[PDB]
C-alpha cells in the first residue's frame, strides 16, 4: 500500500482519525456510522495489500528467482490477478468517495453520507458475476494451494530459503502464504457483518437505509452463489474419485 | 519458536470476535470495538516454551457450509465458544458444532469456553432470560457439556473485563503442544 492511504487509515477509528474539534461538531449517531464505514475501508485497504503481497512479493519473486514450472506457481496463487483487479477498483471507489467528502484545508476531516449506491454497483451486474465466478474458482483451489505449498516447502531447499527470506520482515509476521490464502477466502464473509452494522446506524436518511438494505441482500445472494459453486479440488484426484 | 494454529468456532454472538480482539490488542478498546477480526500471530511463552500462535475466527462463516470448512486445515487447537447469557447457544454445541469439528479436525483438542461471564450477575440479563423461562448458564452445565463432548477442558472468561482471557490462550497453547 501507499503511505498516503496508510497514514489516512492508521488510527483505530474515525473518531481518532479526524481532528477532535471537527469531531465535536457531530451527533453521536453520525460518529458511530462513520466508525464502521472507516473500518470497511480500512479493511478493504488491508485486503488489497494482502493480494499485492501475493502477486508482487511471492508470485513474481518465485517466477524470477526459482526454476519452477509456471503452472506450479499458478496452483499456489490461483486467480490472484483477477482478485487484485476487482478489489483494487472497489477500493479506488471507496477512497474517492472519501476524498470528495473532505473539508477544504484538511486531508483528514470528512463525513460520508452516501455509501449504499456504491455497494449496490459493486455487488450487482457484471461486477457481481465476475466476483462470484472468481471466488467460486479461488475457494475450490484453496486446499490444493495449501498442499502444494507444503509439498514444495518439505522437498525443496531453495524454495524453503526463498520463503524464510521474504517472510523474515516484522511486517510480514501474519502474512505468510497460507495466511494470505485464508485471509482472502474469509474476506467475502466479512462484508455482511460490516454492512449490517453500518445499516444499524444509518436510519436518519431513509433512502440510505434502503440502499444499505438492498446492498446487504445482494451480498448474501453472492455468498450463497459462491458457497454452491465450491467443489474442492485435490492434487492428483483420479477420474473415479470425482464421480462418486 | 514453533508455530501453532488456533481457530475459534461457535454461534453468531458467542463473543468470539470480541475475545480474539481483546487478547490480540495490547491497548484495550475504549473508543471503538472493531466489527471484524482478520488474523493475528501471538508470541506466547507457556511453561518455558516459546510459541507463535496464529489466531482465526469463523465469524460470518456460520451459514456457509462449504466456505466455513476452509478455515480448518492444519488447526492444532479449537476453542469452542458459547455465550453464558444464551442457553440456546449451548444447546447447539453437541448437535451441530462438535460433529463438524470432529469430522474436519480429528484428534484436535477442543477447549469449551463460556464467554461473557460478567453477565451472570447482570440485572437486565436475568430479567430478559426470565421472560423466556431461562437462566444464565451455570458453571456445572458448562463443565457437564464439556465432559459430554470429550473436550480437553472447560474454561470461562469475560472479554468486557479481560478476566480469564490470558489463561484461555495460554491453556490452548499447552493443548496445542500435546
UniProtKB/Swiss-Prot annotation, chain A:
It comes from the Eukaryota. Induction: Up-regulated by bacterial peptidoglycans stimulation, such as muramyl dipeptide and in biopsies from inflamed mucosal areas of Crohn's disease patients. Phosphorylated by AURKA and CDK1 during mitosis, which negatively regulates its activity. Phosphorylation by MAPK1 or MAPK3 increases nucleotide exchange activity. Phosphorylation by PAK4 releases GEF-H1 from the microtubules. Phosphorylated on serine, threonine and tyrosine residues in a RIPK2-dependent manner. The modification N6-acetyllysine is found at residue 150. Residues 32-229 form the DH domain. It is found in: Cytoplasm, Cytoskeleton; Cytoplasm; Cell junction, Tight junction; Golgi apparatus. Transmembrane segments: none annotated. It is linked to Neurodevelopmental disorder with midbrain and hindbrain malformations: An autosomal recessive neurodevelopmental disorder characterized by intellectual disability, speech delay, mild microcephaly, midbrain-hindbrain malformations, and variable dysmorphic features. Activates Rho-GTPases by promoting the exchange of GDP for GTP. May be involved in epithelial barrier permeability, cell motility and polarization, dendritic spine morphology, antigen presentation, leukemic cell differentiation, cell cycle regulation, innate immune response, and cancer. Binds Rac-GTPases, but does not seem to promote nucleotide exchange activity toward Rac-GTPases, which was uniquely reported in PubMed:9857026. May stimulate instead the cortical activity of Rac. Inactive toward CDC42, TC10, or Ras-GTPases. Found in a complex composed at least of ARHGEF2, NOD2 and RIPK2. Interacts with RIPK2; the interaction mediates tyrosine phosphorylation of RIPK2 by Src kinase CSK. Interacts with RIPK1 and RIPK3. Interacts with the kinases PAK4, AURKA and MAPK1. Interacts with RHOA and RAC1. Interacts with NOD1. Interacts (via the N-terminal zinc finger) with CAPN6 (via domain II). Interacts with DYNLT1. The DH (DBL-homology) domain interacts with and promotes loading of GTP on RhoA. Promotes tyrosine phosphorylation of RIPK2. The PH domain has no affinity for phosphoinositides suggesting that it does not interact directly with membranes. This is Rho guanine nucleotide exchange factor 2. The lineage of its organism: Eukaryota, Metazoa, Chordata, Craniata, Vertebrata. The chain holds residues 206 to 447 of 986 of the full protein.
From Swiss-Prot, chain B:
Glycans are attached at residues 32, 35. Its cofactor is Mg(2+). InterPro entries: P-loop_NTPase, Small_GTP-bd, Small_GTPase, Small_GTPase_Rho. The keyword Repressor does not apply. Signal peptide: none annotated. The modification (Microbial infection) ADP-ribosylasparagine is found at residue 39. Its main location: membrane. Residues 59-76 are annotated as: Switch II region. One of its GO terms (biological process) is positive regulation of protein serine/threonine kinase activity. A motif (Effector region) lies at residues 32-40. It is a lipid-anchor. There is a cross-link at residue 133 (Glycyl lysine isopeptide (Lys-Gly) (interchain with G-Cter in ubiquitin)). Interacts with ARHGEF28. Interacts (via GTP-bound form) with RIPOR1 (via N-terminus); this interaction links RHOA to STK24 and STK26 kinases. Interacts with RIPOR2 (via active GTP- or inactive GDP-bound forms) isoform 1 and isoform 2; these interactions are direct, block the loading of GTP to RHOA and decrease upon chemokine CCL19 stimulation in primary T lymphocytes. Binds PRKCL1, ROCK1 and ROCK2. Interacts with ARHGEF2, ARHGEF3, NET1 and RTKN. Interacts with PLCE1 and AKAP13. Interacts with DIAPH1. Interacts (in the constitutively activated, GTP-bound form) with DGKQ. (Microbial infection) Interacts with yopT from Yersinia pestis. It is linked to Ectodermal dysplasia with facial dysmorphism and acral, ocular, and brain anomalies: A neuroectodermal syndrome characterized by linear hypopigmentation, alopecia, apparently asymptomatic leukoencephalopathy, and facial, ocular, dental and acral anomalies. Patients show no intellectual or neurologic impairment. Small GTPase which cycles between an active GTP-bound and an inactive GDP-bound state. Mainly associated with cytoskeleton organization, in active state binds to a variety of effector proteins to regulate cellular responses such as cytoskeletal dynamics, cell migration and cell cycle. Regulates a signal transduction pathway linking plasma membrane receptors to the assembly of focal adhesions and actin stress fibers. Involved in a microtubule-dependent signal that is required for the myosin contractile ring formation during cell cycle cytokinesis. Belongs to the small GTPase superfamily. Rho family. This is Transforming protein RhoA.
Amino acid at each position: 500500500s501507499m503511505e498516503m492511504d496508510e497514514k489516512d487509515f492508521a488510527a483505530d477509528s474515525w473518531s481518532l482519525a479526524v481532528d477532535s474539534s471537527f469531531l465535536q461538531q457531530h451527533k453521536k449517531e453520525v460518529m458511530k456510522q462513520q466508525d464502521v464505514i472507516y473500518e470497511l475501508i480500512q479493511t478493504e485497504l488491508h485486503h488489497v495489500r494482502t493480494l499485492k503481497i501475493m502477486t508482487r512479493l511471492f508470485r513474481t519473486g518465485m517466477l524470477e528467482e526459482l526454476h519452477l514450472e509456471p503452472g506450479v506457481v499458478q496452483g499456489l496463487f490461483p486467480c490472484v490477478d483477477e482478485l487484485s483487479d476487482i478489489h483494487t477498483r472497489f477500493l479506488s471507489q471507496l477512497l474517492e468517495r472519501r476524498r470528495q467528502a473532505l473539508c477544504p484545508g484538511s486531508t483528514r476531516n470528512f463525513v460520508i453520507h452516501r455509501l449504499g449506491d456504491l455497494l449496490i454497483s459493486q455487488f450487482s451486474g457484471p461486477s457481481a458475476e465476475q466476483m462470484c465466478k472468481t471466488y467460486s474458482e479461488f475457494c475450490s483451489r484453496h486446499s490444493k494451494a495449501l498442499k502444494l505449498y507444503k509439498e514444495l516447502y518439505a522437498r525443496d531447499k531453495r524454495f524453503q530459503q526463498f520463503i524464510r527470506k521474504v517472510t523474515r520482515p516484522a511486517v510480514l509476521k501474519r502474512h505468510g502464504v497460507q495466511e494470505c490464502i485464508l485471509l482472502v477466502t474469509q474476506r467475502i464473509t466479512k462484508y455482511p457483518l460490516l454492512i449490517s452494522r453500518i445499516l444499524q446506524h444509518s436510519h436518519g436518511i431513509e433512502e440510505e437505509r434502503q440502499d444499505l438494505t438492498t446492498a446487504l441482500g445482494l451480498v448474501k445472494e453472492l455468498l450463497s452463489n459462491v458457497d454452491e459453486g465450491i467443489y474442492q479440488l485435490e492434487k492428483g484426484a483420479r477420474l473415479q474419485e470425482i464421480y462418486n | 519458536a514453533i508455530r501453532k494454529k488456533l481457530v475459534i468456532v461457535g454461534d453468531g454472538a458467542c463473543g468470539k470476535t470480541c475475545l480474539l480482539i481483546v487478547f490480540s490488542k495490547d491497548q484495550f478498546p475504549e473508543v471503538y470495538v472493531p466489527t471484524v477480526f482478520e488474523n493475528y500471530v501471538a508470541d506466547i511463552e507457556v511453561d518455558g516454551k516459546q510459541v507463535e500462535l496464529a489466531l482465526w475466527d469463523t465469524a460470518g462463516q456460520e451459514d456457509y457450509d462449504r466456505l466455513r470448512p476452509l478455515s480448518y486445515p492444519d488447526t492444532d487447537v479449537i476453542l469452542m465458544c458459547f455465550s453464558i447469557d444464551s442457553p440456546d447457544s449451548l444447546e447447539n454445541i453437541p448437535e451441530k458444532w462438535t460433529p463438524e469439528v470432529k469430522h474436519f479436525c480429528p484428534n484436535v483438542p477442543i477447549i469449551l469456553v463460556g464467554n461473557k461471564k460478567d453477565l451472570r450477575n447482570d440485572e437486565h440479563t436475568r430479567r430478559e432470560l426470565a421472560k423466556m423461562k431461562q437462566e444464565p448458564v451455570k458453571p456445572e452445565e458448562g463443565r457437564d457439556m464439556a465432559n459430554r463432548i470429550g473436550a480437553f477442558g472447560y474454561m470461562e472468561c469475560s472479554a468486557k473485563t479481560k478476566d480469564g482471557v490470558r489463561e484461555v490462550f495460554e491453556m490452548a497453547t499447552r493443548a496445542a503442544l500435546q
